[PDB]
Write a protein that binds this ligand. Sequence first.
Ligand SMILES: O=c1ccn([C@@H]2O[C@H](COP(=O)(O)OP(=O)(O)O)[C@@H](O)[C@H]2O)c(=O)[nH]1
Ligand SMILES: O=c1ccn([C@@H]2O[C@H](COP(=O)(O)OP(=O)(O)O)[C@@H](O)[C@H]2O)c(=O)[nH]1
Ligand SMILES: Cc1cn([C@@H]2C[C@@H](O)[C@H](CO)O2)c(=O)[nH]c1=O
Ligand SMILES: Cc1cn([C@@H]2C[C@@H](O)[C@H](CO)O2)c(=O)[nH]c1=O
Lengths: 234, 234
Amino acid sequence: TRIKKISIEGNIAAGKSTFVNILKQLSEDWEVVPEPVARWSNVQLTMEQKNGGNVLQMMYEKPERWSFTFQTYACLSMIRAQLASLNGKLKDAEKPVLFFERSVYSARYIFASNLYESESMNETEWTIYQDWHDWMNNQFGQSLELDGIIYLQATPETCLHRIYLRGRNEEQGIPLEYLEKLHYKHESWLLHRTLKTNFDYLQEVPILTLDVNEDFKDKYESLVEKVKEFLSTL
Amino acid sequence: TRIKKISIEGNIAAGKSTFVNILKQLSEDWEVVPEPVARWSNVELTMEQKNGGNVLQMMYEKPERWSFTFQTYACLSMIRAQLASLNGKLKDAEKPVLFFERSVYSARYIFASNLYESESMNETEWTIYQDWHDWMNNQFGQSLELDGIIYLQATPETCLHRIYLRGRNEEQGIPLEYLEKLHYKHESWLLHRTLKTNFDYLQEVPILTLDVNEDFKDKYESLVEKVKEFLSTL
Ligand SMILES: O=c1ccn([C@@H]2O[C@H](COP(=O)(O)OP(=O)(O)O)[C@@H](O)[C@H]2O)c(=O)[nH]1
Ligand SMILES: O=c1ccn([C@@H]2O[C@H](COP(=O)(O)OP(=O)(O)O)[C@@H](O)[C@H]2O)c(=O)[nH]1
Ligand SMILES: Cc1cn([C@@H]2C[C@@H](O)[C@H](CO)O2)c(=O)[nH]c1=O
Ligand SMILES: Cc1cn([C@@H]2C[C@@H](O)[C@H](CO)O2)c(=O)[nH]c1=O
């Protein structure tokens, strides 16, 4: 595909959304697909939004009951939104790039996995979920396949302070220990590459790692210089 | 696709499995897609049989916990089996017909809808399922639109007797009233055609209704004859 798909990965509150919104305004050839759940949190009634708010809340409230339904619905929504941009926007750009906020791979290997490990999914649920993921991406994950990943690396402490700054009410109870786990998985996947997945191409996929421990809100030029560099090599 | 697609629909124990297996043998040009969920009940490997067998058994003990999960996997199981058969055979057939045991339509508008109406999925589970169902079918199931439907129509009382004939343990407690609901559901969809769906073409699909109250296992020729005539119109 002429559209380059680039995913932006990283822990809770690392600055993935902040970084994606930065990128979007820098190039007519650059488009972004935000992740689904972020929209689910705010208020100020589309169907995905009603479902999404409700299931978000049930998850927070009773994880061992709703993890499966939540993760399945998050992935559907993400896939449908990624496929929709990939089919709709960017059409007359000469070097078009679609940046995904997270990806189906991180959804399964970071989030869905920690849920199985947390006992929030039972064995049957985990394996139903992986099977669905498998079949459905081996139909669709192909036009979805990534040309590269960008890893936004912040420490848990950094990430915890940023949950605080964001101040989203239901998140203020997430403890350090939880982010240390998600941290470890990201490093396992994107740094040490010791993580094994079904998707064989992912082992060779180019990765750019950006340390984002320092606020980059009004000082992000150097990061972007790094991204443009990375993009010219795929 | 060059292959004609015909669903076999009917209340529980109306005889769909039975007929499908008769139809199988009749022509080299006729192939069948079995409905994933009976193989789940009986007592060797398969990850889907293992998953489905657990999910079905969990369904039986606590439907309000497991209905949404069961229905998702049942429906995934269906699309993949109907897509696999669509791809893998009747390539050398002069007059190819693939018979689907049940359909993604009955699974949703008959059975899932029943689970909701019985309070085994809440509104979000049901709204999520419907969203998921539309998309799983729109994006993946476009080659599975039906050319026809064959309705094996039997009285709630035929099916109760047939459930008693089949002697599946779990199923023996099934009441007539459950069957009547499901029967009226079938009647509205396929006879009256008052059941409105989210699938435009379906309102237009030709429907053959067959009386299967009289045993047909050793005496199926007039039934097959009506099938052969029906098919000729399409
Ligand atoms: O360099 C940064 C990165 C982000 N944030 C803040 O950290 C919070 C969470 O960031 P974001 O929503 O981007 O995190 P994500 O969950 O998308 O990774 C937000 O209030 C940001 O404004 C910040 O102040 N400086
Ligand atoms: O004409 C018939 C149809 C079937 N049955 C029996 O009735 C039960 C219900 O049949 P089937 O499994 O085909 O029903 P379905 O798949 O519709 O639930 C089974 O034990 C069949 O062997 C029968 O004795 N005569
Ligand atoms: C994005 C995502 C988040 N989570 C959890 C649930 C979310 O409330 C929180 C960050 O938004 O992390 C998952 O379990 N799976 C996911 O796919
Ligand atoms: C085939 C099927 C069966 N069922 C239920 C599940 C079982 O409790 C019973 C079969 O004996 O019917 C569904 O809810 N949906 C289905 O699609």
